[PDB]
């Protein structure tokens, strides 16, 4: 009955069944979810079956300086208005239900190559529009409790960078995905590593290191070489501003340790000015395109050392069997040199 009727919000609650058993324990549902709808906004207070014209709400009260009165909307006008409402609801539902196209990063259903936009503004006011974000991984860690049992909390790792040699990574943990994202983005913009680069696009020299049982070898390359590296390394290099490199990872594959070790290496790298100021000699670069020409890169800011470095033959050097293999060419592997995508 009319008295039996009641407000719509409780109807929608009971129809959705948002909470009570389906949600808890994480059992969820087999991909059926009823979307709430607002009919209150849809039709204005005027519409009815009997299309009486109301000068108070439906029609302007005065026309040509003449008062109006109640009148009848005939059958043709009534059905016209009905068709208009039908089509309007159709376009409303169409615009409601549409595709969602978030840029495919590393793969579908993967949160790797997506950017969340620049960092959030600070309280004092600091717009980081130049900074860009990327999400390295996403994993749903669980810890158990007496009353809750399995408790899901999402952890996220993110990195951010200018594109001008300044960047930084961070982590964010929370029950909500967006909240964890925001936490991690703020943490990263607060914790920033800066790294130098030789010609604005490369490291100064080849590096090889290990970090928590994760071995890495990053090799300098000239211009137009490309980025044949892990996808995470490529994202962070895009953020840094360097556009060519080679990189290989062996042993463990853990994203956080990888990022930490890579940033550690790129921060401990040596600049040519520092190396000259340390050694006391003039640096000389030689190219393959340019002939036997000494190209001075940097000189010691202090006084030059008179005697040169004594040429040391058969030096004590630790090197890699993989490097020796690649130099000898006897190595063979179908998976090494491929026609991969753009950079």
């Amino acid at each position: 009955s009319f008295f039996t009727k009641l407000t719509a919000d409780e109807l929608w609650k009971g129809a959705l069944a948002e909470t009570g058993a389906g949600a808890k324990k994480g059992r969820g549902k087999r991909t059926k979810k009823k979307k709430r709808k607002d009919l209150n906004r849809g039709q204005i207070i005027g519409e009815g079956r009997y299309g009486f014209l109301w000068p108070g709400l439906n029609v302007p009260l005065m026309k040509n300086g003449a008062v109006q009165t109640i009148a009848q909307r005939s059958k043709e006008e009534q059905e016209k208005v009905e068709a208009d409402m039908i089509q309007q609801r159709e376009e409303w539902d169409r615009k409601k239900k549409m595709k969602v196209k978030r840029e495919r990063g590393w793969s579908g259903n993967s949160w790797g190559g997506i950017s969340l936009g620049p960092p959030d503004p600070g309280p004092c006011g600091e717009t980081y529009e130049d900074f860009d974000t990327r999400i390295l991984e996403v994993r749903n860690v669980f810890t158990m409790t007496a009353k809750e049992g399995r408790k899901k909390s999402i952890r996220v790792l993110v990195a951010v960078g200018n594109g001008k040699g300044a960047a930084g990574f961070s982590i964010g943990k929370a029950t909500d995905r967006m909240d964890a994202f925001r936490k991690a983005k703020n943490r990263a913009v607060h914790h920033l590593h800066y790294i130098e680069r030789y010609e604005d696009h490369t490291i100064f020299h080849d590096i090889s290191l290990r970090f928590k049982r994760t071995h890495i070898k990053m090799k300098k390359q000239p211009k137009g070489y490309g980025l044949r590296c892990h996808r995470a390394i490529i994202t962070i290099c895009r953020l840094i501003g360097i556009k060519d490199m080679y990189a290989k990872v062996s042993g463990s594959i853990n994203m956080l340790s990888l990022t930490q070790g890579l940033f550690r290496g790129l921060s401990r790298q040596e600049t040519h000015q520092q190396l000259a100021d340390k050694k006391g000699l003039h640096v000389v670069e030689i190219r393959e395109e340019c002939g036997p020409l000494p190209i001075v890169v940097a000189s010691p800011r202090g006084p030059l050392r008179k005697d040169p470095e004594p040429e040391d033959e058969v030096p004590d050097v630790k090197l890699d069997w993989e490097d020796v293999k690649t130099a000898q060419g006897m190595k063979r592997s179908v998976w090494s040199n491929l026609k991969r995508a753009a950079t």
């Binding site: 495919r104 793969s107 211009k223 137009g224 998976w335 491929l338 026609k339 991969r340 995508a341 753009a342």
Partner: protein, 103 residues
């Protein structure tokens, strides 16, 4: 337009900007490493297939030897070696056409 004025036009800039054309294109393929041989063609029987390459989807473009600032899009300005079709994201047909055009 058969001439190369579509590039100097403003619609090309606003649609691409200062970046290359191949930069925005992305391939749908199997997991991890993509196939080493691109699709054979982007159009067939006056019909276009899904996810076509950019030069094929933009019919206004014309692969011509004369458009130097276009044909230099793919070959690196620092390395005279042209890029391969899996790199540029285009089909083999227009790839070969572009190769002989640039030659």
């Amino acid at each position: 337009d058969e001439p190369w004025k579509y590039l100097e036009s403003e619609e090309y800039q606003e649609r691409y900007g200062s970046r290359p054309v191949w930069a925005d294109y992305r391939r749908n393929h199997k997991g991890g490493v993509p196939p080493q041989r691109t699709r054979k063609t982007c159009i067939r029987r006056n019909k276009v297939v899904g996810n076509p390459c950019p030069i094929c989807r933009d019919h206004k473009l014309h692969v011509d030897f004369r458009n130097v600032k276009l044909l230099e899009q793919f070959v690196c300005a620092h390395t005279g070696i042209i890029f391969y079709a899996p790199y540029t994201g285009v089909c083999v047909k227009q790839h070969k056409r572009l190769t002989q055009a640039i030659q």
